[PDB]
From a paper:
ICOS (CD278) is a type I transmembrane glycoprotein that belongs to the CD28 family of co-stimulatory immunoreceptors. On the other hand, ICOS-L (CD275) belongs to the B7 family and is expressed on the surface of APCs5,7,8 and non-hematopoietic cells under inflammatory conditions. Binding of ICOS-L to ICOS triggers distinct intracellular signaling cascades through the conserved motifs YMFM13, IProx14, and KKKY15 in the ICOS cytoplasmic tail. These signaling pathways deliver the co-stimulatory signals that promote T cell activation and differentiation.
Monoclonal antibodies STIM003 and prezalumab target ICOS and ICOS-L, respectively and are currently under clinical evaluation. Using BLI, we confirmed that binding of these antibodies to their respective ligands prevents the formation of the ICOS/ICOS-L immune complex. To elucidate the molecular basis of ligand blockade by the antibodies, we solved the crystal structures of ICOS/STIM003 Fab and ICOS-L/prezalumab Fab complexes at 2.38 and 3.15 Å resolution, respectively. The crystal structure of the ICOS-L/prezalumab Fab complex was obtained using a shark Variable New Antigen Receptor (VNAR) Single Domain36 as a crystallography chaperone. The crystal structure revealed that ICOS and prezalumab bind ICOS-L with a similar angle of approach, and that the ICOS IgV domain is in a highly similar conformation in both complexes (backbone r.m.s.d of 1.0 Å). Both molecules interact with an overlapping surface on ICOS-L; however, prezalumab makes additional contacts with strand F and loop C’D of ICOS-L upon binding, leading to a higher BSA compared to the natural complex (900 Å2 vs. 580 Å2, respectively). As a result of the extended interface, prezalumab binding is proximal to N70, a predicted N-linked glycosylation site. However, the crystal structure reveals almost no interaction with N70 or the N-linked glycan (BSA of 10 and 60 Å2, respectively) therefore suggesting that binding of prezalumab to ICOS-L is largely independent of N-glycosylation. Notably, the angle between the ICOS-L IgV and IgC domains in the ICOS/ICOS-L and ICOS-L/prezalumab Fab crystal structures differs by ~14°, indicating flexibility that can be attributed to a largely flexible linker and minimal interactions between the two ICOS-L Ig domains. Prezalumab uses the heavy chain complementary determining region (CDR) 3 (HCDR3) to mimic the central ICOS FG loop that engages with ICOS-L. On the other hand, HCDR3, LCDR1, and LCDR2 residues of STIM003 resemble the hydrophobic residues of the ICOS-L front sheet that drive the interaction with ICOS.
Numbering used by the authors:
A (entry chain A): 18 to 149, 154 to 231
B (entry chain D): 1 to 52, 52A, 53 to 82, 82A, 82B, 82C, 83 to 100, 100A, ...
C (entry chain G): 1 to 118
D (entry chain F): 1 to 212
The structure:
Amino acid sequence: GDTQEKEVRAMVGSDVELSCACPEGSRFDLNDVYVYWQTSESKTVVTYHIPQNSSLENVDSRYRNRALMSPAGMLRGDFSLRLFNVTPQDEQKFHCLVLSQSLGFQEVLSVEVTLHVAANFSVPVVSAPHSPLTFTCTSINGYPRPNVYWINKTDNSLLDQALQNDTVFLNMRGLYDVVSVLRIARTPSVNIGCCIENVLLQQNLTVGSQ
Amino acid sequence: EVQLVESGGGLVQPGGSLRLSCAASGFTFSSYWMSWVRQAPGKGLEWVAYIKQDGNEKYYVDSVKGRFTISRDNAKNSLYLQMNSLRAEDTAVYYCAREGILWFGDLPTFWGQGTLVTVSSASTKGPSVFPLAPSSKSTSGGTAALGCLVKDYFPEPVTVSWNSGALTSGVHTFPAVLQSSGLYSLSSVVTVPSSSLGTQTYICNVNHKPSNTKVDKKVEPKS
Amino acid sequence: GARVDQTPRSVTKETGESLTINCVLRDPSYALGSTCWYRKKSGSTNEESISKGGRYVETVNSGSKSFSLRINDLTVEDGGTYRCGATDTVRIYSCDYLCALNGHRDAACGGGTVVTVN
Amino acid sequence: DIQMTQSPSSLSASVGDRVTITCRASQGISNWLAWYQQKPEKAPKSLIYAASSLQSGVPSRFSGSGSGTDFTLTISSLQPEDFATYYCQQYDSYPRTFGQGTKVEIKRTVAAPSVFIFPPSDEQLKSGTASVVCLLNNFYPREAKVQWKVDNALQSGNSQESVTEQDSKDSTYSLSSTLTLSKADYEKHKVYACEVTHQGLSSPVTKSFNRG
Ligand SMILES: *[C@@H]1O[C@H](CO)[C@@H](O[C@@H]2O[C@H](CO)[C@@H](O)[C@H](O)[C@H]2NC(C)=O)[C@H](O)[C@H]1NC(C)=O
Ligand SMILES: *[C@@H]1O[C@H](CO)[C@@H](O)[C@H](O)[C@H]1NC(C)=O
Ligand SMILES: *[C@@H]1O[C@H](CO)[C@@H](O)[C@H](O)[C@H]1NC(C)=O
Ligand SMILES: *[C@@H]1O[C@H](CO)[C@@H](O)[C@H](O)[C@H]1NC(C)=O
Ligand SMILES: *[C@@H]1O[C@H](CO)[C@@H](O)[C@H](O)[C@H]1NC(C)=O
Ligand SMILES: *[C@@H]1O[C@H](CO)[C@@H](O)[C@H](O)[C@H]1NC(C)=O
């Protein structure tokens, strides 16, 4: 049971802020406050501020110049961390810790920020090949893994998941692609579409078969 | 506030095992370095062992390597020290401590209260309380001395008060001595006015928790 | 994020006798999706993909969630460091970019295996 | 792996004097040194951290100093409550290591001891043992010699003595010397005496009693 727990949804390749802040007001001394941003599972040190001059280099090469706090923000009580170039490889829980020297080196703030990274898939491409009946659907560059649905545009219902063939790919750049091959018996005027849902973004994209 | 509570100490025979638990509260346990330091009676402070937040890196004393193990459970906010094949050299008071966070220590050490471990072939014995009765020999110029001799108990410690704590003036309780047999003995004495010898009843109360023994003794003068 | 652990870390084997490297995809990963093997030559510190089949034989147990590589008729310059890559119930296009994905929750390369043949 | 050398290991200073303790490290430390004070049978108390910054609740007469290898703890005006053992601990790198410790005694005027004696109890004799106690109260300095004579026969080896800490207000000691015998040895002889010699006494003092 921490002082605060938070989830942060962040886009790949963007700047994100993980908030560790008090109700702002000029009431913190840099020469007094000790701040530690550290990964929660691996316990490695992402960044930190102490009043004495620090050797640095303690930060592994992973976060060295991509994670930063604001000194003016610290003086206002804003110890938030700023990551600069998010990758699906940063999807982990973080932990912020604040101690005071005026106080008994006591914890003024301790928060856990679970960081969920996501990227939006491309608009699906649907093909209409045939057999004695076959549909293929393609989307790329999304995160995390996608769910795919085939929608009957006539009554806005969803076709059964057993009728579709799903295959998930992990490309370079660490994103996800998907191919879904749907097989259904012939009927007059197939009006259907391929829906691809990014669960974390709560976003679905859909294209119909003309 | 920051609190470190040691438990699991006491008395074990040579070659025995003992596990010390340290319950933490008042700070994010998972984020700090943890440590065990010890102090032998009358000797200096000697660090025992250190452990990093995750628990991969551990540091032990040469005197300790291969025999003790630090463990830590951040889920339950507790630190553990497992001792096996204990020797007499290990008899000491053990402090649980909270260290820094960074690789190069930054925060001053925060100390627990200590639990004490006694490794001796001797057994737990309740103390015997005898009166040092005030008389003509232990008086001078309006002042009389009387006392309480607490001998042959094991292991330490005992607590000695006078009149259930009311008398605190001119009370001297002497440090325990390790007798040749391996059992402890101490004396507590008080300097009172002469007039009190006849009118005021003096009780020394001695408590030995290791043997669960509370004793109240009437120190009557010899007239 | 996701992890694969290799055994053994360092082995020396007599010329003409097979060597076996084992790789496991630690839990809570669901199942194996694809398995890539690699080797670097001592000098250039660059890895190259090991073509499966033939002299290099791989055994995979889906229930065990583990895969192994067996080298046969060992040469002296077979030596170097060997890595193995795995993935959790997804597939990849090429083995080129697998180890390039560090800390990803669905891709991880093993620890390495240093081999010296005499 | 880092070594701390503390000097001196012991000292004596009168109240109001200035006291200085030095601590040297095996290798360079960057103000990452703490100073602790410990009173007998109590846990160590943090006095100073980060070379010279006082912890909350430390009188201002305590001063820290130093950088690199050489460090100094300075008591400006010593006070009768300052009798303790002081340690220096480095937390530059793990493992954190301590100094050997400096014991501090307080210098005061020579004070003679008041001497008393206590015979064995009837209960202890019922048990079959006899302990006689010699009590020396409120003296200075700590150096003093108690000698047991049974029928004017010197007793050695069958006695043990204990000394309390310096008193918090007058900085005087109290010593209890116990002469222990079997009940048989107690009843065989008749006169029991302890002879105290101290710097504050012009002549040696003898306290005796005859019984059993
Ligand atoms: C999509 O839903 C519509 C809803 O009506 C289906 O329409 C078919 O309509 C004819 C006559 O109107 C019925 O005899 C068929 O039985 C209906 N289909 C089904 C599956 O019951 C249309 O067929 C649906 N398309 C697909 C591909 O399932
Ligand atoms: C900076 O800090 C290091 C310790 O990390 C110390 O050795 C060095 O002397 C300091 N340099 C300064 C304050 O210029
Ligand atoms: C973001 O990080 C990835 C990680 O390899 C890198 O390939 C990409 O060039 C970076 N983009 C930037 C810094 O704009
Ligand atoms: C993908 O999701 C983002 C959410 O940041 C949204 O702004 C964008 O419109 C979506 N893609 C398309 C093609 O609309
Ligand atoms: C259906 O899924 C299976 C899963 O192994 C795949 O091998 C196959 O290519 C897919 N499509 C067809 C038409 O079987
Ligand atoms: C599509 O996204 C919406 C969220 O806007 C969600 O309610 C729905 O369950 C998703 N899936 C569909 C419509 O198949």
